Design an enzyme around this catalytic site. Sequence first.
Site, PDB file in Angstrom:
ATOM      1  N   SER A  49       0.793  -1.231   0.000  1.00 51.00           N
ATOM      2  CA  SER A  49       0.000   0.000   0.000  1.00 51.00           C
ATOM      3  C   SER A  49       0.820   1.272   0.000  1.00 51.00           C
ATOM      4  CB  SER A  49      -0.916   0.055   1.199  1.00 51.00           C
ATOM      5  OG  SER A  49      -1.989  -0.851   0.989  1.00 51.00           O
ATOM      6  N   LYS A  52      -0.208   3.397  -2.900  1.00 47.41           N
ATOM      7  CA  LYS A  52      -1.376   4.258  -2.926  1.00 47.41           C
ATOM      8  C   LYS A  52      -0.985   5.732  -3.082  1.00 47.41           C
ATOM      9  CE  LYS A  52      -4.493   3.292   0.211  1.00 47.41           C
ATOM     10  NZ  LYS A  52      -5.215   2.772   1.433  1.00 47.41           N
ATOM     11  N   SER A  86      -7.384   0.326   5.285  1.00 46.02           N
ATOM     12  CA  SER A  86      -7.471  -0.671   4.221  1.00 46.02           C
ATOM     13  C   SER A  86      -8.696  -0.405   3.341  1.00 46.02           C
ATOM     14  CB  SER A  86      -7.540  -2.080   4.800  1.00 46.02           C
ATOM     15  OG  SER A  86      -7.613  -3.048   3.776  1.00 46.02           O
ATOM     16  N   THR A 177       2.020   3.456   5.472  1.00 43.01           N
ATOM     17  CA  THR A 177       2.340   2.061   5.795  1.00 43.01           C
ATOM     18  C   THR A 177       2.051   1.158   4.622  1.00 43.01           C
ATOM     19  OG1 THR A 177       0.185   1.878   6.850  1.00 43.01           O
ATOM     20  CG2 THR A 177       2.057   2.256   8.347  1.00 43.01           C
ATOM     21  N   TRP A 179       2.024  -3.438   4.063  1.00 48.69           N
ATOM     22  CA  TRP A 179       2.306  -4.793   4.587  1.00 48.69           C
ATOM     23  C   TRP A 179       1.858  -5.802   3.576  1.00 48.69           C
ATOM     24  CZ3 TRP A 179       0.955  -6.391  10.342  1.00 48.69           C
ATOM     25  CH2 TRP A 179       1.463  -7.677  10.578  1.00 48.69           C
ATOM     26  N   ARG A 220       5.934  -1.153  13.124  1.00 51.13           N
ATOM     27  CA  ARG A 220       6.674  -0.264  12.188  1.00 51.13           C
ATOM     28  C   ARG A 220       6.810   1.148  12.782  1.00 51.13           C
ATOM     29  NH1 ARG A 220       2.445  -1.857   7.748  1.00 51.13           N
ATOM     30  NH2 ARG A 220       1.345  -1.508   9.738  1.00 51.13           N
TER      31      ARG A 220
HETATM   32 NA    NA Z   1      -4.664  -0.416  -2.331  1.00 55.11          NA
END
Ligand code: NA
EC number: 3.5.2.6
Length: 234
Positions: A49, A52, A86, A177, A179, A220
Site C-alpha cells: 500500500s 497508494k 485498508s 504504511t 504490509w 513499524r
Molecule cells: Na490499495
Amino acid sequence: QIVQGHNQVIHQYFDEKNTSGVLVIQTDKKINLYGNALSRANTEYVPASTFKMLNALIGLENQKTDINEIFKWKKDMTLGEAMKLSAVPVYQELARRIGLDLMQKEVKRIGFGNAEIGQQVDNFWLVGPLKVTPIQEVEFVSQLAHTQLPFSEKVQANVKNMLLLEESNGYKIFGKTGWAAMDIKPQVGWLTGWVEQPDGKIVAFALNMEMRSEMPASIRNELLMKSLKQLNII
Ligand code: NA
Ligand code: NA
Ligand code: NA
Ligand code: NA
Ligand code: NA
C-alpha cells in the site's frame, strides 16, 4: 548518500524484534542507512500500500477522481479518508479507472522501482510484478514532500495532505504504511514518509522490514519513532 549512519543503537532495536530491517534516512542530498540488515536498502520488494501514494497522484492528475468524490461502499469514503485505511476496493476502483495502459505509462514516466505493472491493473502493487527498493522509496517520497515530482503542484499538495500520520511538539510526520501479508513470502512491511521539523526542514524516511503474522501493525511506527528519536530527527 549512501552510507551507513551511526547505527549502534538502532541495529539493536531491530534485533530485539528478532527480524531483519533497514531504515533509510534522506536529508537534502544525503542518504544514511540504519538497522540490522542494511542490504535490504537496495533490495527490491513489492510496494504494497505504499503505492497508494502514486495511485492517488496519477488518478488526481488525470482527473479520474477528485478529493471530494464519495466512493460508495457497495462505509462511503473519499480518496483521502481511504488513504490511511485498508480500502483496496477504493484504490482498486481508482486503478481500474486509470486503466492498465495509462497506469503503465505514468509509472514508466515517474520511473518508480522496476516500473513493471504487468497485466492486472488492480493488484500489481500487492503481489508483483512491480517492485521497488527502500532507497528508491525514500527518494520518491522526498520528491513528493518538496513538490518535485512531475505532477501538478496542487495534486502533490493534495496527496501530501492525505498522508499526515501523527504530530507532536511542532513536528509533523507524514507517511504511508504497507504490509505485503498475503500471497507473498517473506512478508514485507513498509513505513515511508517524512518529518517536517518546526523550522520547516524536511527529513525523509523509508523503513522496510520482514513481518510475521503475529506482529502488531504498530511495530513499524514503534521502531520508526524510537529510531527518529535516537537520531534527533524528532
Ligand atoms: Na490499495
Ligand atoms: Na517482495
Ligand atoms: Na461523489
Ligand atoms: Na506506535
Ligand atoms: Na530526540
